[PDB]
Ligand binder design. Sequence first.
Ligand SMILES: OC[C@H]1O[C@H](O[C@H]2[C@H](O)[C@@H](O)[C@@H](O)O[C@@H]2CO)[C@H](O)[C@@H](O)[C@@H]1O
Ligand SMILES: OC[C@H]1O[C@H](O[C@H]2[C@H](O)[C@@H](O)[C@@H](O)O[C@@H]2CO)[C@H](O)[C@@H](O)[C@@H]1O
Lengths: 422, 417, 405, 407
Amino acid sequence: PPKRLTREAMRNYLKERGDQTVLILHAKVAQKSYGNEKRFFCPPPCVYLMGSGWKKKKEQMERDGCSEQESQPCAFIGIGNSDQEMQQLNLEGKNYCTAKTLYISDSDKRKHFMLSVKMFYGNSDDIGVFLSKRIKVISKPSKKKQSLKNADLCIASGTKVALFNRLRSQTVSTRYLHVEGGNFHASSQQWGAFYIHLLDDDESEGEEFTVRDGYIHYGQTVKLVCSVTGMALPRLIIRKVDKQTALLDADDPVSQLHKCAFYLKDTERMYLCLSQERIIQFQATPCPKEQNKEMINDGASWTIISTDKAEYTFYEGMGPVLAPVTPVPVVESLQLNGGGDVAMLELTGQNFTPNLRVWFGDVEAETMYRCGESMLCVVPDISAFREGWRWVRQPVQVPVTLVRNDGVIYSTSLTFTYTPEP
Amino acid sequence: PPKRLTREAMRNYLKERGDQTVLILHAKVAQKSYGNEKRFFCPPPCVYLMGSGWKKKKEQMERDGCSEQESQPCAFIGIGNSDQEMQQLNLEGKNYCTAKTLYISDSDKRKHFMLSVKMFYGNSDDIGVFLSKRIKVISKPSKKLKNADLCIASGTKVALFNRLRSQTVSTRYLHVEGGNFHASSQQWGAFYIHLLDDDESEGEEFTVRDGYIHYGQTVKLVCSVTGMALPRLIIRKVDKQTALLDADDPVSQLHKCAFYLKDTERMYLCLSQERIIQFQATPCEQNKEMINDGASWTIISTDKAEYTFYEGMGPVLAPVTPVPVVESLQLNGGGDVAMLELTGQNFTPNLRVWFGDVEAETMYRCGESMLCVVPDISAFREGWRWVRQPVQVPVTLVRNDGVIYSTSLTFTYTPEP
Amino acid sequence: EEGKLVIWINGDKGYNGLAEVGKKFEKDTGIKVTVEHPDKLEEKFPQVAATGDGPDIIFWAHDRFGGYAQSGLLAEITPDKAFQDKLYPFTWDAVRYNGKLIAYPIAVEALSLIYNKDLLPNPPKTWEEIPALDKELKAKGKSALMFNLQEPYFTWPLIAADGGYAFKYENGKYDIKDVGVDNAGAKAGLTFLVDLIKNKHMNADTDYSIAEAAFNKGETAMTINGPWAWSNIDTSKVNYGVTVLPTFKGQPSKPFVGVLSAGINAASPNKELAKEFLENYLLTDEGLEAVNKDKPLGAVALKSYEEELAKDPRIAATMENAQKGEIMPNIPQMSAFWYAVRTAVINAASGRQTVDEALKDAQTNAAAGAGLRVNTSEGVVLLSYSGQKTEGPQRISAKISQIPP
Amino acid sequence: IEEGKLVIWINGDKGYNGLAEVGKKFEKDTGIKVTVEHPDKLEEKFPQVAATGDGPDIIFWAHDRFGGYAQSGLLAEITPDKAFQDKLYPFTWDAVRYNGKLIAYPIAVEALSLIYNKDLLPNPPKTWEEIPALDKELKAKGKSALMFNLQEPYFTWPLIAADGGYAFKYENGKYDIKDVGVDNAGAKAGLTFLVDLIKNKHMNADTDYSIAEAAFNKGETAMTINGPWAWSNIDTSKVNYGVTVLPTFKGQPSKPFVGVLSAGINAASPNKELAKEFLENYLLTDEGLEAVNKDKPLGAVALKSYEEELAKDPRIAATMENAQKGEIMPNIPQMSAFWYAVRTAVINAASGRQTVDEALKDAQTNAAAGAGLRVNTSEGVVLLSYSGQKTEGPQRISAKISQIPPA
DNA sequence: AATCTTTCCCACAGT
DNA sequence: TTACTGTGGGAAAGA
DNA sequence: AATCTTTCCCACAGT
DNA sequence: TTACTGTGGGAAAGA
Ligand SMILES: OC[C@H]1O[C@H](O[C@H]2[C@H](O)[C@@H](O)[C@@H](O)O[C@@H]2CO)[C@H](O)[C@@H](O)[C@@H]1O
Ligand SMILES: OC[C@H]1O[C@H](O[C@H]2[C@H](O)[C@@H](O)[C@@H](O)O[C@@H]2CO)[C@H](O)[C@@H](O)[C@@H]1O
């Protein structure tokens, strides 16, 4: 029988925080495959398992008699259509797995889709289904003039992008810009998400730089900062690459899956290049016919694509549950409401269900379900946090947490504060 | 039918104050009459009618067809005895009257009593019964620490009369008329007998010391009505027909005494018919001085009973008495809501405390204690006076038939940050 | 359109005076200038400018320009040092958004108490004594006070006096989560205004024109208005005075200080012609005189003309009220704040909502990340939340990796 | 009262054996026997015995009770020489002045301070609000945070005053015997906090002087609130103690009621000159005051010469800081009625017999005859008062003199 | 035992 | 002279 | 009518 | 020589 979460059980969780997190890292767009061709999603969608909960769950299962194979989390990935078969990901040993052979066919007439990650333990126990963020289907990258009206296909300052390189003549057909051991390299297995920041044409080279807002256009000065390590490449000028030539005379907005060139700011025609796993500089030969074009090899020709991240965090607060932990709710924002009789907190997000309750610390709130994107709760009175030795009128800060009727705890990065006023 | 007082009617009264006041001025003590003798109360108890209400009532009654005799207030005075007759007082023409032939017999075994004044209009319309303050019965004046009731204290009112056996007018009284001191045959004044230090110089401004008045002490006699004072005088004891300089004994009730003018050639407070003058005392014993009958006065502590009423909702069938008198107030925070406790006399269940034109929820305990619910400040923020500011209002007792009983007390609401 | 300047300015400002400046520019350069005053231009401009239309130059107080800059409707103004020195540094601070100048400041304006000297020689020092003045005046067939109750700008000095505030200024920025629209101070101020209305001292239906008519006709003893209103009172037969706003609960009324600014539309093809007209024609002693002559500007941003106007007791009164008040934030949240306070003031004045309910709704409507004050058995508690951090600083710190040669 | 012998009354919490040594010195010098006594409730006893014409020759108590004793005529007027008056601080003479007359000799200035155990608590709390948190920590170690006398309002007054509470307001050059600050918000917040410490078991309502003294000196409690007189017993217990500033309430300083230990001479006493001799030339000397201080500390002594030598002491330096944050008590006769009202309120609120509001409201109207009463209204706090018949007593009378003709 | 209080008696005042 | 009647003074009882 | 988007086709790269 | 298959580039079809 299912057990509702107790205050003691909640208090223990808030002290430990042995959460089980599932991360889905992917591109915001996908190119359509025509006929019987298979155009694989690039960079390959990645599934990461984070949190100390996984080890805790393994140890709990193995105390129940599970072998390492039985306690091992297993995952399958596919697009939101049944016509295509789901592909297995091998997590066993590693903390992550990348799906290298996913594609969307001409038969699939959807304009937008989400990746579906079906997780379970090796003993067939179901964990649940975790969806990615929305992926827009594109026919081909826009070979002509782009505009801010097609914002979905444009790249904005301060947003994450993935940089990959197609190498037809090389053994490793495609390499990805990644940061490992505080150094930039062209990885065959891993790919990094980089904040593409736009800067003023007069901004000098340095560790500290002022970032200007807007959509990235060709010829502009950009700083690529690693979303994980915080490592940045020196000031670069993003240029349009045509066949095997970088053109200096481009002002057009930079779009999804476009052929790129990254000229190092204030250098003798040097550009961002690749020599096997290592990234190096490349001397460009200017064309004698056109003074606006410069010759650049395949290793200097990169591909830009905007990336997204789906995150789901859960914990079995009252021990193992029969029902899967999914759909895992995600809280995007909060807003207080003074328009009514009592103070209300309005939660905006995804995957909300009637069987959830908002908790302020170890205090269960009266929760009202509206839809999967909107939930309301009655903000507890401050007296609920003055029960013991903490009776003195003082500021109180508590976490905001979603809890399912079977004791499953859905962590939030949000806190709530009661501040006494004279 | 009786009408309850309206806020409009109350507002009008508070602006005008055309009250009807009844004053009973008398001595605090009375000497017992033995056998068939009649020892009259001296000075004679006086009944005064103060306030513009009397003339208003006269004019109202006369618009109803009453003659001057019918509209004329009539009064009878007696003691609280159903064996002694009540004496008629003649107010007709004047606003006051003295009861010159009142006495307490040996048969009346009471150790104290109050004078009963029964008032009504000439047309038999009953005003009511007004009692005096307590009068203590004494056998004879003590020529003596044990009794403070028979002693005279600094700052208290006294009456000074003069017995003149050889003169046509057997007894004269110290009184102030037209800003001048005189020995009246009809009227008597109440004088605050203030004690001052022996080094206090003569003047309009003087510092008054406390304590019981003894002989040889420097006294300042100030008229309770006009505020007129006699020059600094030394109260001396009188034995037969001589002023005693070597007397230190405390001054008691109904004592024969003289009043030597401070820093003068043996000059004393004397009288020549209706006028008061100074008498030169011939020294005879260096501690004794010869003084005539006119220089020999009699001291007696006096009291005052005051009753103020107003027919707020016009003429009333029932008498206006007993008129409630408010002695003191005290607030109470021991309960749920703020309460005002009234202490006094003649309280009835038909009374209500009013704070300005705001009738309060009044609770009757007994005739001496009254409680009321202090109105909320919002009751005084009803018009353009809604702004948070200090509010001062009179405290007034009102009867169910609209009779308004004035008080000298005010109530204040003071906003605080 | 190219070759001609289209200018938008509010109807209560010196548009005919500004049109004289346009006729001077037309006789000097040959470029035609059109001065327009459309209704609700603060709302109109962001709609027309978004599509790429509207005017070339927009005139409004600095408070709306921050949102216009965020939306990308404004051109970055880049004046020379010689020009920047001709204007007060604090006026340039009002027109600065994310280290960029987005408009040209023209004049500093604040609300003051405008009183009738014949009807009232000694104006009230406090708000609390106005109902007593109303009783006296009502007997003479007149009234004490009349001001615009449809625009929160006029009621804000009373709301701010005891403790009300838009956004708190923490460190070197505004805390877009710290809103003081439902604090005790704001509540006491709006309760007082509602009490003046409930007790018939003021009418909830009173707007700008109704109050202006009553003052200029000598029907009301006092009005609350800015420098722009002085010209019409001059033409009327009123011996008026401009003084300090009355105090509330012993504290000064804090009006919101506005800086009349001129921004250039990002979509405009006459960006140089706009810079030429604004710098060398309008922001001159002769240029600012023309506008001021029609309707007074207040304390002008141009140092040279301000010095000549400083001797005016009316401008001296405006500055005293400006000093006791506060310069408005130019932040994008200001528009949402104003709409919330407008609704609260109207609903409390009409009796539609209580003061508490109106200011509580206004509190959470003003900023999206704002708190809410609650009355508890232990006292007033401020409810707030955090953890959805989304901003990204202007400056980024990142260690440079070497690209090997 | 026997002639040729001095009878002295002093409180049991003071240095009576030290004062007895001064009496032995007087006896060996003049031949006059001196008897030092410490009877229970002598502040109440003295006005009863003195009224009949009996009691001690010399009375020791804080200056606050002497005003009433002077009004009743129980005290003899103090008339010292200029040379003597200058030996004592002018403010100490101001405390013993009633109606432009000196009614007692000042001895020492005393104020309550926070006495903490340095081993149990090296850093004492700066605020009252952090004491319950310090209590949780100490309770785990089998100890408690705070323990002080809850039977005497003197000890609870610093908390009551802190936020806004006062006895009588000082208007112009006098105390307004009608303006009492016992039921204001500040006083209410202070007593509510004390009641909350009791309700939440951090303190016990039954705690008196001896109970708290035992707990501190035995090392059972981390802190105590007491005056300089209590230091001697803590010294014998060898507790590593500290004397510091009282903790703040609602961010404001705790305001203790500053007392001036004074010695008055009974008006009925036939040994007034013998009393003046003993007090001026024997007690109010460096050697004389040293004897009393050696028994139980006096605090900041009135004698300038001895105070200078004791000023270097950090405990006396702490007493003065607490005194400076507080206020010198009024000497006015209404002080006795005030104290009885606050004692009742504190006891009834702590016991749960009455709520804080009901206790402090009753205390307000019982503190003085003709005191106001505060009420909470929809428009705010309103003070209810009545312009009744306040005793007053007209001192000066203006009257035009009518002349008696010479005839 | 004083000292104070109460009760009874009487000279005195001018027609 | 005395009768007429309130009044202070004084003596003799009581407390 | 352009200009942009979508669909279809094909050369290219290595055991 | 040819088979094996994703991939960018380019033309032709739609919008
Ligand atoms: O009432 C809200 C409104 O206040 C301010 O507008 C003022 C303006 O600054 C003055 O120059 C004048 O035109 O009156 C206006 C109010 O009627 C703010 O500037 C504005 O953004 C806001 O909507
Ligand atoms: O508690 C009421 C009480 O407080 C004061 O007494 C103090 C005294 O001043 C100190 O020197 C020491 O002895 O402790 C006493 C408290 O027990 C007032 O002086 C006193 O009148 C009041 O009743």
